[PDB]
């Protein structure tokens, strides 16, 4: 036997980025566990938030900017 | 008094607000706030409930999964 490298496409989600999960026919002892593994892999591909911007394009760089008047912000990853 | 912040993820579709509840006192650093938002985003990523082949058949068991196809589509709730 050999492990299987599956490619997962998230329904409706853009940009179109493949999520790869390695599953073993003799390890995955449950279909629900496969779904959990896929769920974790999707969560892992979430880029960590590195920057924040106001709607008008100013970078939010400190706690003071963050607790001002605006309560809507744009998050950018890497 | 806690602040309810709406985060919009850049370039991500569909357009779904991520809300984070933050307190000016409890938030110790700006990095802490970025981490709490990152965690909030990962949480709102729905748990995968159904899988489908490209052609439209639901994959519902281990045997369907270890067939010949190796590309699938995930659906949440």
């Amino acid at each position: 036997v050999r492990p299987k490298l599956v490619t997962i496409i998230r329904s409706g989600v853009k940009p179109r980025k493949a999520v790869r999960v390695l599953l073993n026919k003799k390890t995955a002892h449950s279909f629900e566990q496969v779904l959990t593994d896929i769920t974790e892999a999707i969560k892992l591909e979430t880029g960590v938030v590195k920057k924040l911007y106001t709607l008008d394009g100013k970078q939010v760089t400190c706690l003071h900017d963050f607790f001002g008047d605006d309560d809507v912000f744009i998050a950018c990853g890497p | 008094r806690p602040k309810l912040v709406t985060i919009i993820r850049s370039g991500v579709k569909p357009r779904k607000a991520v809300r984070v509840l933050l307190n000016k006192k409890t938030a110790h650093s700006f990095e802490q706030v970025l981490t709490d938002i990152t965690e909030a985003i990962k949480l709102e990523t729905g748990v995968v409930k159904k899988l489908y082949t490209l052609d439209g058949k639901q994959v519902t068991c281990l045997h369907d999964f270890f067939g010949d196809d190796d590309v699938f589509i995930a659906c949440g709730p």
Partner: peptide, 6 residues
Amino acid sequence: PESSEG
């Protein structure tokens, strides 16, 4: 262009 989902 192939197209499918859901």
